[PDB]
Structure 1
Amino acid sequence: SMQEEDTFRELRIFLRNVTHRLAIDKRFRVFTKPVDPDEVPDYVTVIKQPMDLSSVISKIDLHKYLTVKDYLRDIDLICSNALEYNPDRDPGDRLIRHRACALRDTAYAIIKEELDEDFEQLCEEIQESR
């Protein structure tokens, strides 16, 4: 229905705002764009399902997220991919892991503070009826 489409549009507006706030954070610059194959060639090999904040924005605009849970699974994927690609004790790897975990923590904290739980439940119940 029209009211249901209004609900998903409000969700997209909210998700764009969260994603923008993550993308402008200097700590998260390494996650804003796909990994460039030149600067690092083994990434395409190790990481089967790449995700970054620019791809998240594209999926929002393609109406791919109908719930907050669909969105956070892609935030979770940005994080888990970074931990998998950077497992070593060396400081370069450790720095990316710390930033990845901070990105995930920040997104969850924004949603916990600013998303009404009844709004997320509505999105869920609309989606379960489709």
Structure 2
Amino acid sequence: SMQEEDTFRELRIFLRNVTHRLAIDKRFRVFTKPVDPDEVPDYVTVIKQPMDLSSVISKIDLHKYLTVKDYLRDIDLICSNALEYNPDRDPGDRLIRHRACALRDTAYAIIKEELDEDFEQLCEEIQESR
């Protein structure tokens, strides 16, 4: 229905704003664009589901997220991919892992403070009905 499309449109607006706030954070720069296989050689073969903030925006705009839970699955993927690809004790790997975890924690904290749980419940119920 039109009321349901208004719900998903508000969800997209909310998701774009959260994504923009992550994207402008200096700590999260290396998560703003897809990992370039030319600059990071074995990446696209090791990481099966690459995910980054520009692809998250692309997915919002393509109406791929019908709930905040679906969006957060992709945020979790940015974090888990970095933990998998950079698992060593060296400072380089520890820094990207900390930034990846911080990106995921910031997204969850923004949503905890700003997302009305009845709004998410409505999105979940329209999705489950389709």
Q: Scaled by the length of structure 1, what TM-score is found? A: 0.99
Q: Identity percentage over the alignment?
A: 100
Q: Which runs of 5+ in 2 are unaligned?
A: none
Could you tell me how far 1:41 is from its partner in structure 2? 0.7
Provide the alpha-carbon RMSD of the alignment.
0.4
Q: Distance in 2 between matches of 1:39 and 1:88?
A: 19
Which shows bigger deviation, 108-117 or 40-49?
Answer: 40-49
Could you tell me how far 1:37 is from its partner in structure 2? 1.2
Which residue does the alignment assign to 2:51?
Answer: 51
Q: Distance in 1 between matches of 2:103 and 2:110?
A: 11
- The yes-or-no answer on 1:28 pairing with 2:28 is yes
Could you tell me how far 1:79 is from its partner in structure 2? 0.3
Q: Which runs of 5+ in 1 are unaligned?
A: none
Q: Distance in 2 between matches of 1:19 and 1:40?
A: 24
- Stretches (4+) displaced over 4 A: none
Q: Scaled by the length of structure 2, what TM-score is found? A: 0.99
Q: Distance in 2 between matches of 1:48 and 1:121?
A: 31
SS at match of 1:36: coil
Could you tell me how far 1:7 is from its partner in structure 2? 0.1
- The yes-or-no answer on 1:115 pairing with 2:106 is no
Could you tell me how far 1:110 is from its partner in structure 2? 0.2
Could you tell me how far 1:120 is from its partner in structure 2? 0.2
Could you tell me how far 1:57 is from its partner in structure 2? 0.1
